[PDB]
C-alpha positions in Angstrom: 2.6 -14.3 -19.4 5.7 -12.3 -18.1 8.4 -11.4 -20.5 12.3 -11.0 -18.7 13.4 -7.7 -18.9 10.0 -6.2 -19.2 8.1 -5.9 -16.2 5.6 -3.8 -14.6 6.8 -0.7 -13.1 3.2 1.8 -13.1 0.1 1.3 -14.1 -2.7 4.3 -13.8 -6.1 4.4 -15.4 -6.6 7.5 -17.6 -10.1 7.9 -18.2 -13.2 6.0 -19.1 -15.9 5.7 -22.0 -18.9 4.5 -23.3 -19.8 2.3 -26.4 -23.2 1.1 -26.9 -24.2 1.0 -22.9 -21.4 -0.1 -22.1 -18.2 1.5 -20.2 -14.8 0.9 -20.6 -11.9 2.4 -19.1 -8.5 3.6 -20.8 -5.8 1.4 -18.4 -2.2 2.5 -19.3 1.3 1.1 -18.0 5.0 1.1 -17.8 7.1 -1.8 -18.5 10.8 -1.9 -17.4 12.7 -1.5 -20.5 10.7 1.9 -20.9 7.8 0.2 -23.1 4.0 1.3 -22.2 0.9 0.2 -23.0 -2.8 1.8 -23.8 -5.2 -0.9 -22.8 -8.8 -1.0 -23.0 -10.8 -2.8 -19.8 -13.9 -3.2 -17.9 -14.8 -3.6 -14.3 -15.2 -7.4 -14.9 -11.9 -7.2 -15.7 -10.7 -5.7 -12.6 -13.3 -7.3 -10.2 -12.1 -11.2 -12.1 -8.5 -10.5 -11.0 -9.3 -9.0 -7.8 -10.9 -12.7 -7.3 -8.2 -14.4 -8.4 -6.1 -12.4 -5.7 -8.1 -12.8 -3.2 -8.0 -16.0 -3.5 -4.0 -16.8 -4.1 -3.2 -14.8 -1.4 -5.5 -15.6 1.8 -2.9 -13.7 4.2 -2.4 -10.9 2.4 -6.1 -10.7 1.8 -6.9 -10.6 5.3 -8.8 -13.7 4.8 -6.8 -16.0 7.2 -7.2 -16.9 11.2 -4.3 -17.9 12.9 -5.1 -20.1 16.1 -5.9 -17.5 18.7 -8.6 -16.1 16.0 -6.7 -13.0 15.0 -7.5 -12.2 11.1 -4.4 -11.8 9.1 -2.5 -8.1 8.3 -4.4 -6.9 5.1 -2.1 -5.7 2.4 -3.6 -6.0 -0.8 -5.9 -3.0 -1.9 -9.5 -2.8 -2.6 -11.5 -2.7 -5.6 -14.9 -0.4 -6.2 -17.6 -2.7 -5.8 -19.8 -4.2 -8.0 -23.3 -2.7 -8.5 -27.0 -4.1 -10.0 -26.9 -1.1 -12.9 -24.4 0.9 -14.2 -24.4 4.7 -14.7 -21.9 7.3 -15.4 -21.5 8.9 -12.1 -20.8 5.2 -10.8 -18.3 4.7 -13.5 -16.4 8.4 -13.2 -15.8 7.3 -9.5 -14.8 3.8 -10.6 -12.1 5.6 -12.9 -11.1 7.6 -10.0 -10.6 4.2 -7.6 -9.1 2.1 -10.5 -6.5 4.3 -10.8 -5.2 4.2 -7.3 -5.9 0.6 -7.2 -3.7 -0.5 -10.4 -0.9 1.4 -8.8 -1.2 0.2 -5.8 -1.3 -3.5 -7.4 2.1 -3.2 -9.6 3.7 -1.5 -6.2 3.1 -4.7 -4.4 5.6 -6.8 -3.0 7.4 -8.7 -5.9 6.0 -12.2 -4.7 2.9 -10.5 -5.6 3.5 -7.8 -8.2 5.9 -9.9 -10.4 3.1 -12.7 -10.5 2.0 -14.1 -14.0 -1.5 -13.2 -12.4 -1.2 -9.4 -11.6 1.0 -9.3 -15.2 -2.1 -11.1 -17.1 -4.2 -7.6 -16.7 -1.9 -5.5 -18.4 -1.0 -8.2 -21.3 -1.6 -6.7 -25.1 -4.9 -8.0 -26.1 -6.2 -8.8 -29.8 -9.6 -6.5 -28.6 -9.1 -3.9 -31.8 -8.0 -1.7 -29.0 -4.4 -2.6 -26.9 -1.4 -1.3 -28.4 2.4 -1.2 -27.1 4.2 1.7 -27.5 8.4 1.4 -27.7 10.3 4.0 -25.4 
């Protein structure tokens, strides 16, 4: 979903956290009518839209040959990869990487950053956790 008059100018990720094995990061953002957000998401979260991308944009991806065999101009950033077992020194670097990489997704050009797709990370979610904040 996108809402006119309230879209993404910065995202960071803040810091991360463990509930019963499992780690979650604190993802916050900046609408454009001065609105933020404290979000609650996991890697999946951000490796499942880094799919998505990947996948929408081929050329900006660097996943496209033109016909001399050149790979297309990568643009889009990368995400920390994913890893068989999970520990806290893996995730304090993820929350490190995550942050750069959420900034570096909302400061995309607009055919990208403006997307429904890139938007749908930062949505409020009915998780007991996501809240909107009003300027």
């Amino acid at each position: 979903k996108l809402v006119d008059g309230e879209l993404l100018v910065k995202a960071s990720v803040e810091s991360f956290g463990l509930e019963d094995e499992k780690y979650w990061f604190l993802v916050c953002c900046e609408l454009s009518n001065g609105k933020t957000r404290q979000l609650k998401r996991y890697y999946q979260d951000f490796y499942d839209l880094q799919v998505q991308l990947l996948d929408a944009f081929p050329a900006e991806a660097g996943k496209l040959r033109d016909a001399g065999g050149q790979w297309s101009k990568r643009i889009m950033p990368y995400i920390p990869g994913p890893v068989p077992y999970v520990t806290n020194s893996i995730t304090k670097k993820r929350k490190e990487d995550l942050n750069i990489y959420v900034a570096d997704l909302v400061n995309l050009p607009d055919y990208i950053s403006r997307s429904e797709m890139v938007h749908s990370l930062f949505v409020v979610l009915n998780n007991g956790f996501d809240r909107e904040f009003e300027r």
